[PDB]
Write a protein that binds this ligand. Structure first.
Ligand SMILES: [Mg+2]
Ligand SMILES: [Mg+2]
Ligand SMILES: [Mg+2]
Ligand SMILES: [Mg+2]
Ligand SMILES: [Mg+2]
Ligand SMILES: [Mg+2]
Ligand SMILES: [Mg+2]
Ligand SMILES: [Mg+2]
Ligand SMILES: [Mg+2]
Ligand SMILES: [Mg+2]
Ligand SMILES: [Mg+2]
Ligand SMILES: [Mg+2]
Ligand SMILES: [Mg+2]
Ligand SMILES: [Mg+2]
Ligand SMILES: [Mg+2]
Ligand SMILES: [Mg+2]
Ligand SMILES: [Mg+2]
Ligand SMILES: [Zn+2]
Lengths: 37, 146, 60, 214, 176
RNA sequence: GAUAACCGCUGAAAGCAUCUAAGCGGGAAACCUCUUCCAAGACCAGGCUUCUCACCCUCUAGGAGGGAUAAGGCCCCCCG
RNA sequence: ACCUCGAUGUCGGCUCGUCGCAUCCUGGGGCUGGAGCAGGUCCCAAGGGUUGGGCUGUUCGCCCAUUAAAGCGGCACGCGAGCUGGGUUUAGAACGUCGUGAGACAGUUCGGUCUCUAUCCGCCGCGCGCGUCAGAAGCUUGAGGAAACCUGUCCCUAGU
């Protein structure tokens, strides 16, 4: 998990979502998994 | 000279308010009005001519938003690090009456008279109360239109 | 205000209506009526309410 | 359910294990008790058994106290105490007038013992709270046993509640947990409990089955 | 929306009872209960289909509309056929066996792992390494299958542990 | 028991996908209980019981004032 | 340069602590260029714990043995009406240096009075009075508080 003010899709399989009031990027590649914070 | 209450002048009555599905703040403001005696033309700020208020179904009180989990009642014991907090959700489960009690008390004047006024508030979690001997009048929270 | 609201009118509309009716009783005596003669106060409330505009929330 | 009995601390001695290890023991006179009252959820709002212990001349018992013993149908005793019970099924095991003896326990059971600790009088901070005190030399001026600082400075400009200071020490209710009963003597009515128990000899104690190891 | 608009077929062997917002659907496997969100409206095409409808194109109604269609469609699909999740074990010495209602696994821990079946679910072992979970409620079947799936940490090096039947786990090579 | 990070199930808005928007679950020495002690001056001053449950006088016939008692208590006394 | 120069005593140590989390250990997790052991990094977490010595007035720092770890900070760089007084920063004396000199030196050196019977708040303990709708006594409920909360090694599972 990356926790940063800026969260960006790192590859074209990354999808930006909002979950429980946080912006998150979910992906099949667990490196790209990241959370705004 | 402006009318002033004398010894025998104050007449009490008993009201019962059903708190079921009522917004906490709305119930508390109405009850504070009755306890203070603001609805009587004989009102005098140095006299408690208020009425007795019974609140029933205080566990069915309604709270909006996320206040059930995010509103915290704070208490300090006076010892260092003696600050304890409970959510309104947790306080409603353990001490249902405390939620309504605290709301009303915080809307009364914080002085000696206010403490005497608090005597006349009775709050019960269930649908029943022991004061049938006083024959309380059902009180509905209305709004006078203008 | 307590006596007005017991007669189903707010204070502010009572004062407006008494002005429109031209009733010049001041608040010292209006309060003395509210305490000592509720019947006379009720009659004043009826006068005030009659003199109020039909739509209080309308322009003018 | 949680067994218990009232008794008197008689004193300490030494016994030997069957594998020849030494065992320090306190001897407790787990004297006969009588059930004087039963507390019920329906009467009192909680479940408990009231026990009475120790011989007393009826000359000495005050009339309202005698009235309560008379309503129970038992002779007065010096000491009355309640044992709190978790449930009403446990209460059902007791009846007014019934006698309890040391044999309610068996050897190797774990007990908690409650008693009043010895009085120590007005104690300094070194004795009462284990303060280190100050140096006996190197210039230290009349502070060898003094507590030192008791607070910060302008902020908070006061001493906090709970600040450890000198004062009366001892004479407190103390419960020692998980003591092994080494032996039960049914003939003398005595418990040999491994280890120490609070109080002076001749003092009232309450022996209960251990909550944690029961 | 585009999901909620589609009716739900009720086969002639399926009994649907609609009581206001309460819904109860009875079928060969048993009976299942569902409650629709107040705004959404659930009717019935007398022909033999379920119609889900919404008052407004407001966002909350739009979301609850598609939700409620699929929930009742799952409810029907449960009492007709049931839900089954096939699961498979990988790794040497990793084993499963059934002990009454309870399922017992040996995934290389010092102790064995015992999982009790909650009400309305059942376990079947076809092999020491291959088993299944079945039940009436899709959510309960999924829930138990997930708990079993987490019995071991993910192993991307040797591939051990519990998987789904088709499951394609992530793999890597630890060459040291 | 309720949670944190985190893991999820069932799923729309958005024919796919999504732990979330309706709902349903796992989850830590922190939190609430649990263990020990204080505690009804907790002025909402609580509860279960037991004992005494009794008498004279004065003012005026209102409310008081005084004296003698019961259960009990205190002081003195022998002590810890 | 805004309070205090009709006075708010300093560094370090000692005693006693109390709070924050930007976490040193122990607890829970995501990702690893994570095989395993052992790590790297980020997230959550403040309940408790967080050693003794050599040198220096020292803080700091270096070092010697340990440890699960030897956390970083606030509170007048917490704490001198609680202690110390080695350094600094009165008066003595000396060296180097500067000055014609009297003298001077964030240069050095040896020496050099640490006052106060606690009124108020505060805190630790202990009584007296009155109250809790008659006067008393035994046993109690617990609203609400306080205390406590650390961790290792070895042996099995497994030389798997
Ligand atoms: Mg001296
Ligand atoms: Mg000395
Ligand atoms: Mg009482
Ligand atoms: Mg005395
Ligand atoms: Mg200026
Ligand atoms: Mg001055
Ligand atoms: Mg943090
Ligand atoms: Mg804790
Ligand atoms: Mg300082
Ligand atoms: Mg000082
Ligand atoms: Mg000189
Ligand atoms: Mg010269
Ligand atoms: Mg000398
Ligand atoms: Mg010197
Ligand atoms: Mg000098
Ligand atoms: Mg409590
Ligand atoms: Mg208090
Ligand atoms: Zn990606």
């Amino acid at each position: 998990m990356k926790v940063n003010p800026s969260v960006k899709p790192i590859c074209d399989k990354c999808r930006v979502i909002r979950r429980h009031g946080r912006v998150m990027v979910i992906c099949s590649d667990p490196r790209h998994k990241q959370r705004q914070g | 000279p402006t009318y002033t209450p004398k010894a025998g002048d104050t007449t009490r009555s008993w009201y019962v308010i059903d708190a079921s599905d009522v917004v906490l703040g709305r119930l508390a403001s109405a009850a504070a009005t009755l306890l203070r005696g603001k609805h009587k033309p004989t009102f005098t700020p140095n006299v408690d001519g208020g009425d007795f208020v019974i609140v029933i179904n205080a566990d069915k009180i309604a709270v909006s938003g996320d206040k059930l989990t995010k509103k915290f009642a704070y208490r300090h014991s006076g010892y260092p690090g003696g600050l304890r907090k409970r959510t309104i959700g947790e306080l409603l489960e353990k001490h249902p009456t405390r939620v309504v009690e605290n709301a009303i008390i915080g809307m009364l004047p914080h002085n000696k008279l206010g403490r005497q006024i608090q005597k006349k508030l009775k709050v019960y979690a269930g649908p029943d109360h022991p004061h049938a001997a006083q024959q309380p009048i059902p009180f509905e929270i209305k709004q006078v239109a203008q | 205000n307590a006596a007005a609201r017991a007669n189903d009118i707010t204070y502010n509309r009572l004062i407006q209506g008494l002005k429109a009716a031209g009733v010049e009783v001041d608040r010292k005596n209006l309060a003395e009526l509210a305490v000592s003669d509720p019947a006379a106060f009720t009659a004043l409330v009826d006068v005030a309410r009659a003199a109020l505009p039909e739509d209080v929330n309308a322009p003018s | 359910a949680r067994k218990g009995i009232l008794g008197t601390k008689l004193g300490m001695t030494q016994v030997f294990d069957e594998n020849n290890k030494v065992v320090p023991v306190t001897v407790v006179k787990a004297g006969p008790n009588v059930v004087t009252r039963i507390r019920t959820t329906e009467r009192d709002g909680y479940s408990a058994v009231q026990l009475a212990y120790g011989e007393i001349s009826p000359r000495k018992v005050i009339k309202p106290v005698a009235g309560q013993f008379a309503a129970a149908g038992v002779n007065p005793r010096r000491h009355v105490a309640e044992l709190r019970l978790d449930d009403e099924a446990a209460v059902a095991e007791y009846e007014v007038g019934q006698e309890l003896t040391a044999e309610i326990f068996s050897d190797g059971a774990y007990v908690d013992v409650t008693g009043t600790s010895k009085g120590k009088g007005f104690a300094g901070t070194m004795k009462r709270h284990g303060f280190r005190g100050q140096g006996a030399a190197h210039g230290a001026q009349a502070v060898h046993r003094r507590p030192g600082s008791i607070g910060g400075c302008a902020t908070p400009g006061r001493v906090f509640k709970g600040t450890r200071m000198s004062g009366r020490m001892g004479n407190d209710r103390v419960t020692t947990q998980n003591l092994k009963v080494h032996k039960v003597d049914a003939e003398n009515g005595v418990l040999l409990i491994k280890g120490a128990i609070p109080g002076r000899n001749g003092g009232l104690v309450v022996v209960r089955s251990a909550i944690k190891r029961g | 929306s585009r999901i909620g608009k589609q009716p739900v077929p009720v086969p002639s062997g399926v009994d649907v009872t609609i009581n206001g917002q309460n819904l109860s659907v009875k079928g060969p496997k048993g009976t299942l209960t569902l409650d629709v969100a107040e705004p959404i409206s659930v009717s019935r095409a007398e022909d033999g289909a379920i119609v889900v409808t919404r008052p407004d194109d407001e966002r909350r109604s739009r979301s609850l509309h598609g939700l409620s269609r699929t929930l009742i469609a799952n409810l029907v699909t449960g009492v007709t056929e049931g839900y089954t999740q096939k699961m498979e074990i990988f790794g040497v010495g990793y084993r499963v066996q059934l002990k009454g209602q309870n399922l017992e696994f040996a995934l290389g821990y010092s102790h064995p792992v015992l999982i009790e079946a909650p009400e309305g679910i059942t376990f079947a072992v076809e092999s020491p390494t291959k088993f299944s979970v079945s039940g009436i409620d899709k959510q309960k079947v999924g829930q138990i299958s997930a708990v079993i799936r987490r019995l071991r940490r993910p192993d991307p090096y040797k591939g051990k542990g519990v998987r789904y039947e088709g499951e394609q786990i992530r793999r890597k090579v630890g060459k040291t």
